[PDB]
């Protein structure tokens, strides 16, 4: 509350550390469904159904331009990528499996780097 604060965590490396995680996600062999925005002209249903599209290139641009106020907003966008994937793709499909794989890959890096 006012004049009552927890001891100050060093947040000075967060930006660089999120960039490293994102590089690791970008170079994963199963990243291909997530590298670029879904083409809303060429994929029927996507625009209407997926209210907040997100992909790794868009997270990169947001990260590089100071549009993440803290590491929780970064994680929320990465998770949105995988939540969108699950909404639109059957679990038993190459893309559906890719999303599960990448989500796990991310969540481990997240815990290992910050928790």
Cβ neighbours of residue 100 closer than 8 Å, sequence gap 6 or more: 82, 91
Q: Exposed, middle or buried: residue 102 (CB in 10 Å: 0-12, 13-18, 19+)? A: buried
Return the residue matching tokens 């890719």.
Answer: 98
Query: What resolution does the deposited structure have, in angstroms?
Result: 1.6
- Could you count the other beta carbons within 10 Å of the beta carbon of residue 114? 13
Q: 54: Cβ–Cβ under 8 A, 6 or more apart, which residues?
A: 77, 80, 81, 84
H or E stretch at 113: helix 94-114
**List of domains in the chain:** 1-115 (1.20.920.10)
Specify the experimental method. Answer: X-ray
């Amino acid at each position: 509350s006012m004049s009552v604060k927890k001891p100050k965590r060093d947040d000075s490396k967060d930006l660089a550390l999120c960039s490293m995680i994102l590089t690791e996600m970008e170079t994963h062999e199963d990243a291909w469904p997530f590298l670029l925005p879904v083409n809303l002209k060429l994929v029927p249903g996507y625009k209407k159904v997926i209210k907040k599209p997100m992909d790794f290139s868009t997270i990169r641009e947001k990260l590089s331009s100071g549009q993440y106020p803290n590491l929780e907003t970064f994680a929320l966008d990465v998770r949105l990528v995988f939540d969108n994937c699950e909404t639109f793709n059957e679990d038993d499909s190459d893309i559906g499996r890719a999303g599960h794989n990448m989500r796990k890959y991310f969540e481990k890096k997240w815990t290992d780097t910050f928790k």
